[PDB]
């Protein structure tokens, strides 16, 4: 029963690492959307500078 409770604690510790990898994926997607929106604004300023 001690061996079972030790291995149960190790399984719960692994669920915590999967959520961190998902937070990184969400941040990386939001920052990609943000980079695209800032490229469009930079292209608008480049047109104003050509004028």
- Span between the terminal Cα atoms of the chain, in Å: 77
d(Cα 40, Cα 43) in Å, to the nearest integer?
A: 5
Q: How far is the CB of 6 from other proteins (least distance, A)?
A: 15
The DSSP 8-state label assigned to residue 1 in this structure reads -
Nearer to other proteins, 3 or 51 (CB): 51
CB of 46 to other proteins, least distance (A): 12
Distance of CA 24 to the CA centre of its chain: 3
**Where do contacts with other proteins occur on this chain (CB under 8 A)?**
12, 15-16, 19, 23, 25-27, 29-34, 36-38, 41, 44, 48, 51
């Amino acid at each position: 029963q001690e061996q079972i409770q030790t291995a149960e604690r190790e399984i719960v510790g692994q669920d915590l690492n999967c959520e961190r990898a998902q937070d990184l994926c969400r941040r990386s997607l939001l920052l990609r959307a943000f980079n695209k929106k800032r490229e469009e604004e930079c292209e608008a300023l480049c047109q104003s500078n050509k004028k």
